[PDB]
Amino acid sequence: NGSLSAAELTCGMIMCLARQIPQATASMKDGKWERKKFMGTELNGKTLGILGLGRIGREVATRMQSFGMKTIGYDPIISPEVSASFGVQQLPLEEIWPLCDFITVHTPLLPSTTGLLNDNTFAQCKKGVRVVNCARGGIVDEGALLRALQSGQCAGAALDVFTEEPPRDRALVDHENVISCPHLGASTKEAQSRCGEEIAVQFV
Amino acid sequence: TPNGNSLSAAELTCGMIMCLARQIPQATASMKDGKWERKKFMGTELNGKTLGILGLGRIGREVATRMQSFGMKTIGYDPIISPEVSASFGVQQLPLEEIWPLCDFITVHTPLLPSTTGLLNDNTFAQCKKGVRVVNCARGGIVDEGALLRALQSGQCAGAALDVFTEEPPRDRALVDHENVISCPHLGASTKEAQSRCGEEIAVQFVDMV
Numbered sequence: 001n002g003s004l005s006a007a008e009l010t011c012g013m014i015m016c017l018a019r020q021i022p023q024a025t026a027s028m029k030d031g032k033w034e035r036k037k038f039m040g041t042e043l044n045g046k047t048l049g050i051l052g053l054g055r056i057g058r059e060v061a062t063r064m065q066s067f068g069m070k071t072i073g074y075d076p077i078i079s080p081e082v083s084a085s086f087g088v089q090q091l092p093l094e095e096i097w098p099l100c101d102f103i104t105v106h107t108p109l110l111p112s113t114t115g116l117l118n119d120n121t122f123a124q125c126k127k128g129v130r131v132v133n134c135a136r137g138g139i140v141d142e143g144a145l146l147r148a149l150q151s152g153q154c155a156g157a158a159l160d161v162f163t164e165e166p167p168r169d170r171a172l173v174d175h176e177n178v179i180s181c182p183h184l185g186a187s188t189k190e191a192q193s194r195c196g197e198e199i200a201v202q203f204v
Numbered sequence: 205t206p207n208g209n210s211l212s213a214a215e216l217t218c219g220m221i222m223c224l225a226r227q228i229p230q231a232t233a234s235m236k237d238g239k240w241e242r243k244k245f246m247g248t249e250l251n252g253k254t255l256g257i258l259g260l261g262r263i264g265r266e267v268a269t270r271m272q273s274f275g276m277k278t279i280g281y282d283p284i285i286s287p288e289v290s291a292s293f294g295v296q297q298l299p300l301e302e303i304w305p306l307c308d309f310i311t312v313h314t315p316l317l318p319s320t321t322g323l324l325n326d327n328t329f330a331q332c333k334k335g336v337r338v339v340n341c342a343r344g345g346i347v348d349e350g351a352l353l354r355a356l357q358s359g360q361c362a363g364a365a366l367d368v369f370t371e372e373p374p375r376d377r378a379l380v381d382h383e384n385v386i387s388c389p390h391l392g393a394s395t396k397e398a399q400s401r402c403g404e405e406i407a408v409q410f411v412d413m414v
């Protein structure tokens with residue numbers, strides 16, 4: 001609740017996967033002018049899968065809906081009626097993977113949510129899928145993710161969170177198709193002020 | 205045919221607005237360099253902030269509706285679009301001189317004409333808020349390149365996002381190389397969907413003659 005900053009970064013990560021804005025910026029700083037290399041894809045009419053439909057997940061959904069993206073997802077707690085109010089069609093996990101163009105994770109870190117995006121899951125996904133993780137490290141299996149990026153099963157990945165912070169295994173962050181942030185989800189003057197203030201109202 | 209690439213240009217602008225606010229390309233470059241800087245890449249929350257959209261045609265109106273879902277206050281200017289017509293798509297129109305002090309973010313969506321050339325100048329940046337962020341995904345020259353560098357070097361402009369330049373590729377790299385500047389090699393229309401739409405709409409016009 002103290003959320004909108006993690007949701008805005010996730011949305012900004014989605015826009016970066018579609019047009020490769022960080023890669024295009026790094027290319028420019030190197031004195032290059034590569035038009036052909038950074039030919040992207042439109043967000044209008046594309047399917048975004050949202051696994052975890054809490055406070056973050058619903059804000060991402062409403063923001064990405066204004067872009068013409070189809071918002072579908074899953075949550076074991078959130079009823080189909082609650083998800084339908086904010087325009088998210090709930091389907092079972094196995095029916096979500098092949099329809100998705102973009103996938104974002106917004107669940108807490110739990111053993112059941114650890115490795116949610118694995119080799120078996122990625123194989124069920126559409127070829128050239130884009131994955132976002134601005135939640136917690138370990139939700140998307142890093143080993144399974146690098147393999148999918150290597151094979152082309154996953155076209156791109158935007159990672160704010162990792163299993164180890166700072167990560168020693170640089171294979172993911174070094175990959176050209178990977179967008180990265182050093183855990184910047186909550187890193188805003190507006191959210192940290194709200195987090196610092198909301199800890200006092202729950203106290204009293 | 206400008207209608208065919210309007211949605212792709214609108215999306216990239218929104219992308220550039222997010223990238224300025226959370227320093228995503230700068231954070232990626234730092235991570236790619238093998239660094240971990242949390243309290244260095246301090247972002248800003250877009251909710252409640254004011255976005256000024258100068259030019260309210262197809263791209264200007266599509267940027268507004270997307271940024272409205274982020275809780276951004278969308279204000280702007282267009283001498284052709286009426287204040288009642290702009291209000292129908294959530295844009296509060298005010299005279300050009302009143303827009304500058306209210307903006308946190310400014311984005312230009314006008315065609316290139318002598319009247320639009322140098323729209324963001326030294327006199328224009330002086331009326332702006334200290335720490336304003338500027339987006340130019342329309343045509344190089346609407347935002348005066350010389351004035352923009354002065355604003356970025358004095359702290360008057362906290363950051364710039366430029367897809368376009370007066371010279372393409374730009375010979376002068378002083379803007380491109382600045383730490384608070386993010387850039388793209390004219391990717392505004394560079395998408396399969398817009399390229400196929402523009403490619404179809406131009407072909408039918410040539411067929412229309414006979």
Ligand SMILES: Cc1cc2c(cc(C(=O)N[C@H](CO)c3ccc(S(=O)(=O)CC(=O)O)cc3)n2C)c(Cl)c1Cl
Pocket residue numbers: 001051052053054055056057074075076077078093106107108109110112113116135
């Ligand atoms: C296997 C599996 C288990 C799952 C989920 C989803 C949840 C869950 O806990 N849902 C609730 C919302 O009902 C929730 C609560 C706090 C956060 S959060 O702390 O990340 C910040 C936030 O988003 O508010 C996110 C989501 N669980 C236990 C999914 Cl999808 C799968 Cl597949």
Ligand SMILES: Cc1cc2c(cc(C(=O)N[C@H](CO)c3ccc(S(=O)(=O)CC(=O)O)cc3)n2C)c(Cl)c1Cl
Pocket residue numbers: 206258259260261262263264281282283284285300312313314315317319320323341342
């Ligand atoms: C001094 C001054 C003069 C201006 C404007 C605005 C226009 C203008 O022509 N407006 C119309 C829409 O009424 C229009 C047409 C095509 C495009 S476009 O699609 O080619 C570019 C894009 O949208 O990126 C954008 C806008 N004029 C002549 C402004 Cl604001 C100022 Cl200050």
